[PDB]
Scaffold this active site. Structure first.
Site, mmCIF file in Angstrom:
data_model
loop_
_atom_site.group_PDB
_atom_site.id
_atom_site.type_symbol
_atom_site.label_atom_id
_atom_site.label_comp_id
_atom_site.label_asym_id
_atom_site.label_seq_id
_atom_site.Cartn_x
_atom_site.Cartn_y
_atom_site.Cartn_z
ATOM 1 N N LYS A 21 0.837 -1.170 0.000
ATOM 2 C CA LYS A 21 0.000 0.000 0.000
ATOM 3 C C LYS A 21 0.912 1.276 0.000
ATOM 4 N N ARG B 66 1.873 1.763 -3.598
ATOM 5 C CA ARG B 66 0.691 2.148 -4.350
ATOM 6 C C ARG B 66 0.413 3.624 -4.139
ATOM 7 N N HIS C 118 2.448 6.141 -2.814
ATOM 8 C CA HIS C 118 3.527 7.078 -2.887
ATOM 9 C C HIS C 118 4.630 6.873 -3.847
ATOM 10 N N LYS D 176 -8.971 11.155 -1.031
ATOM 11 C CA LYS D 176 -7.874 11.316 -0.074
ATOM 12 C C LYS D 176 -7.484 12.827 -0.159
ATOM 13 N N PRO D 177 -7.459 13.523 0.969
ATOM 14 C CA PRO D 177 -7.159 14.950 0.960
ATOM 15 C C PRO D 177 -5.783 15.470 0.526
ATOM 16 N N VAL D 178 -4.714 14.830 1.002
ATOM 17 C CA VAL D 178 -3.341 15.226 0.704
ATOM 18 C C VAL D 178 -2.549 13.966 0.513
ATOM 19 N N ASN D 179 -1.730 13.909 -0.538
ATOM 20 C CA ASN D 179 -0.908 12.727 -0.837
ATOM 21 C C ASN D 179 0.397 13.047 -1.613
ATOM 22 N N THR D 180 1.511 12.474 -1.190
ATOM 23 C CA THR D 180 2.744 12.777 -1.875
ATOM 24 C C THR D 180 3.240 11.583 -2.674
ATOM 25 N N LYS E 252 5.117 12.597 13.086
ATOM 26 C CA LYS E 252 4.240 13.690 13.439
ATOM 27 C C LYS E 252 3.295 13.288 14.601
ATOM 28 N N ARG F 18 -2.711 18.037 -3.429
ATOM 29 C CA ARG F 18 -3.583 18.596 -2.406
ATOM 30 C C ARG F 18 -4.923 18.901 -3.031
ATOM 31 N N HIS G 152 16.044 -20.780 14.920
ATOM 32 C CA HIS G 152 16.240 -22.278 15.051
ATOM 33 C C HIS G 152 17.647 -22.547 15.509
ATOM 34 N N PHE G 153 17.805 -23.564 16.318
ATOM 35 C CA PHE G 153 19.126 -23.920 16.723
ATOM 36 C C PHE G 153 19.541 -25.023 15.764
ATOM 37 N N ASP G 154 20.644 -24.841 15.063
ATOM 38 C CA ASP G 154 21.088 -25.808 14.032
ATOM 39 C C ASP G 154 22.076 -26.829 14.514
HETATM 40 N N1 LIG Z 1 -6.759 20.577 0.457
HETATM 41 C C1 LIG Z 1 -5.794 21.128 1.198
HETATM 42 C C2 LIG Z 1 -4.889 22.102 0.618
HETATM 43 C C3 LIG Z 1 -3.926 22.613 1.414
HETATM 44 N N2 LIG Z 1 -3.803 22.213 2.722
HETATM 45 C C4 LIG Z 1 -2.769 22.745 3.593
HETATM 46 C C5 LIG Z 1 -1.542 21.861 3.840
HETATM 47 C C6 LIG Z 1 -0.380 22.733 3.332
HETATM 48 O O1 LIG Z 1 0.737 22.682 4.251
HETATM 49 P P1 LIG Z 1 1.751 21.411 4.248
HETATM 50 O O2 LIG Z 1 2.970 21.708 5.020
HETATM 51 O O3 LIG Z 1 1.886 20.920 2.838
HETATM 52 O O4 LIG Z 1 0.923 20.382 5.120
HETATM 53 C C7 LIG Z 1 0.469 19.159 4.570
HETATM 54 C C8 LIG Z 1 0.727 18.037 5.533
HETATM 55 O O5 LIG Z 1 0.238 16.830 4.934
HETATM 56 C C9 LIG Z 1 1.060 15.772 5.309
HETATM 57 N N3 LIG Z 1 1.275 14.934 4.151
HETATM 58 C C10 LIG Z 1 1.945 15.209 2.995
HETATM 59 N N4 LIG Z 1 1.906 14.231 2.139
HETATM 60 C C11 LIG Z 1 1.188 13.238 2.784
HETATM 61 C C12 LIG Z 1 0.864 11.924 2.370
HETATM 62 O O6 LIG Z 1 1.176 11.330 1.275
HETATM 63 N N5 LIG Z 1 0.134 11.262 3.339
HETATM 64 C C13 LIG Z 1 -0.238 11.774 4.574
HETATM 65 N N6 LIG Z 1 -0.966 10.955 5.380
HETATM 66 N N7 LIG Z 1 0.076 12.987 4.983
HETATM 67 C C14 LIG Z 1 0.787 13.661 4.031
HETATM 68 C C15 LIG Z 1 2.296 16.302 6.017
HETATM 69 C C16 LIG Z 1 2.213 17.790 5.707
HETATM 70 O O7 LIG Z 1 2.646 18.580 6.802
HETATM 71 C C17 LIG Z 1 -0.966 24.147 3.384
HETATM 72 C C18 LIG Z 1 -0.412 25.204 2.462
HETATM 73 O O8 LIG Z 1 -0.507 24.774 1.110
HETATM 74 O O9 LIG Z 1 -2.357 23.975 3.092
HETATM 75 C C19 LIG Z 1 -4.692 21.248 3.264
HETATM 76 O O10 LIG Z 1 -4.499 20.854 4.411
HETATM 77 N N8 LIG Z 1 -5.694 20.743 2.473
HETATM 78 N N1 LIG Z 2 17.628 -40.438 21.086
HETATM 79 C C1 LIG Z 2 18.513 -40.205 20.087
HETATM 80 C C2 LIG Z 2 19.879 -39.985 20.402
HETATM 81 C C3 LIG Z 2 20.714 -39.721 19.401
HETATM 82 N N2 LIG Z 2 20.287 -39.700 18.115
HETATM 83 C C4 LIG Z 2 21.234 -39.439 17.030
HETATM 84 C C5 LIG Z 2 21.536 -37.940 16.783
HETATM 85 C C6 LIG Z 2 22.991 -37.787 17.271
HETATM 86 O O1 LIG Z 2 23.763 -36.841 16.499
HETATM 87 P P1 LIG Z 2 24.037 -35.338 17.044
HETATM 88 O O2 LIG Z 2 25.052 -34.848 16.152
HETATM 89 O O3 LIG Z 2 24.346 -35.400 18.478
HETATM 90 O O4 LIG Z 2 22.622 -34.594 16.829
HETATM 91 C C7 LIG Z 2 21.926 -34.642 15.544
HETATM 92 C C8 LIG Z 2 21.852 -33.248 14.917
HETATM 93 O O5 LIG Z 2 21.052 -32.398 15.758
HETATM 94 C C9 LIG Z 2 21.594 -31.115 15.734
HETATM 95 N N3 LIG Z 2 21.148 -30.380 16.899
HETATM 96 C C10 LIG Z 2 21.798 -30.091 18.077
HETATM 97 N N4 LIG Z 2 21.071 -29.351 18.873
HETATM 98 C C11 LIG Z 2 19.886 -29.146 18.184
HETATM 99 C C12 LIG Z 2 18.733 -28.393 18.515
HETATM 100 O O6 LIG Z 2 18.495 -27.717 19.531
HETATM 101 N N5 LIG Z 2 17.780 -28.447 17.510
HETATM 102 C C13 LIG Z 2 17.890 -29.118 16.337
HETATM 103 N N6 LIG Z 2 16.859 -28.967 15.503
HETATM 104 N N7 LIG Z 2 18.941 -29.852 16.014
HETATM 105 C C14 LIG Z 2 19.907 -29.802 16.980
HETATM 106 C C15 LIG Z 2 23.060 -31.159 15.349
HETATM 107 C C16 LIG Z 2 23.210 -32.549 14.711
HETATM 108 O O7 LIG Z 2 23.312 -32.333 13.307
HETATM 109 C C17 LIG Z 2 23.545 -39.175 16.990
HETATM 110 C C18 LIG Z 2 24.846 -39.537 17.657
HETATM 111 O O8 LIG Z 2 24.759 -39.402 19.076
HETATM 112 O O9 LIG Z 2 22.459 -40.071 17.341
HETATM 113 C C19 LIG Z 2 18.927 -39.939 17.817
HETATM 114 O O10 LIG Z 2 18.553 -39.928 16.656
HETATM 115 N N8 LIG Z 2 18.067 -40.177 18.811
#
Ligand SMILES: Nc1ccn([C@H]2C[C@H](OP(=O)(O)OC[C@H]3O[C@@H](n4cnc5c(=O)[nH]c(N)nc54)C[C@@H]3O)[C@@H](CO)O2)c(=O)n1
Ligand SMILES: Nc1ccn([C@H]2C[C@H](OP(=O)(O)OC[C@H]3O[C@@H](n4cnc5c(=O)[nH]c(N)nc54)C[C@@H]3O)[C@@H](CO)O2)c(=O)n1
Lengths: 124, 124
Positions: free
Chosen positions: B7, B10, B12, B41-45, B66, B85, B119-121
């Site tokens: 958005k 879209r 800006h 929409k009143p004001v958009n850049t 702001k 504006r 994840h712990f690898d």
């Molecule tokens: N129809 C009109 C015509 C003129 N104005 C005002 C705003 C102008 O001051 P700005 O500082 O531009 O203030 C504008 C503010 O708008 C904000 N702004 C700017 N662009 C965006 C935008 O894309 N989204 C958003 N939510 N706010 C925006 C931040 C700026 O300070 C002022 C003088 O022209 O008149 C109005 O309020 N409505």
């Molecule tokens: N009851 C059991 C006991 C042992 N095993 C296997 C896995 C063991 O290898 P590891 O390298 O200790 O561990 C295997 C892998 O796991 C990894 N590891 C370690 N810590 C974590 C963890 O927190 N999360 C995770 N997803 N993998 C982990 C690292 C190693 O590649 C192997 C030899 O002891 O027997 C089993 O299958 N069932």
């Protein structure tokens, strides 16, 4: 309604502690983060670093993910992590896991949405 | 349905022309971009710059919107734009606009999501 970002936190973040503090860490965590919900997730890693340091990984070394995709990143430094593995006697719904502490570089898949204009505010 | 970003283009975007062709520009573009469909929409850049250039604005001088929110950006360079504006005669369905060409810095509100981990690898 859970963002993927929040999903990663839930499944992998545990910054409240520096390391797994007992061999039952995984049994506890895998259940509390709902990873035993409809089956026992067999392999899961928890990371013991600030959320900031983990997130920063997405700006570090780009590597290929183990599934081929290219949005994976490897941490420049090791991080304290906990490897959770389903043991040979586990069986849903009594999921059982082996807990292993480690210090390794983590590799993660990162995702975002570049910022784009969505509203014209003003010109100046 | 239409995305916020689609958005925005879209409403800006008009890279296909480098300035308003004539004084009827706004009457024509407000109509073709559907900014007069159910109301006038009143004001958009419209912006006569490449899509690349307009989107890069989200990376430029951040300024306040702001309405008080803080996601607005101002272009470093001035850009070619057209102010649309409403005239006093504009009455739906016969929306009418005054076209004014200019070169100013645009200010737009941007949206997206930080590139974060999803994840712990693997570890290595
Ligand atoms: N129809 C009109 C015509 C003129 N104005 C005002 C705003 C102008 O001051 P700005 O500082 O531009 O203030 C504008 C503010 O708008 C904000 N702004 C700017 N662009 C965006 C935008 O894309 N989204 C958003 N939510 N706010 C925006 C931040 C700026 O300070 C002022 C003088 O022209 O008149 C109005 O309020 N409505
Ligand atoms: N009851 C059991 C006991 C042992 N095993 C296997 C896995 C063991 O290898 P590891 O390298 O200790 O561990 C295997 C892998 O796991 C990894 N590891 C370690 N810590 C974590 C963890 O927190 N999360 C995770 N997803 N993998 C982990 C690292 C190693 O590649 C192997 C030899 O002891 O027997 C089993 O299958 N069932």
């Amino acid at each position: 309604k859970e963002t993927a970002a929040a999903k990663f936190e839930r499944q992998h973040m545990d910054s409240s502690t520096s390391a797994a503090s007992s061999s039952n860490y995984c049994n506890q965590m895998m259940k509390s983060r709902n990873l035993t919900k409809d089956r026992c997730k067999p392999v899961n890693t928890f990371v013991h670093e600030s959320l900031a340091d983990v997130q920063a990984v997405c700006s570090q070394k780009n590597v290929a993910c183990k599934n081929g995709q290219t949005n994976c990143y490897q941490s420049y430094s090791t991080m304290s992590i906990t490897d959770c593995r389903e043991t040979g006697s586990s069986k849903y719904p009594n999921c059982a896991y082996k807990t292993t502490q480690a210090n390794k570089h983590i590799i993660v898949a990162c995702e975002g949405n570049a910022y784009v204009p969505v509203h014209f505010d003003a010109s100046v």
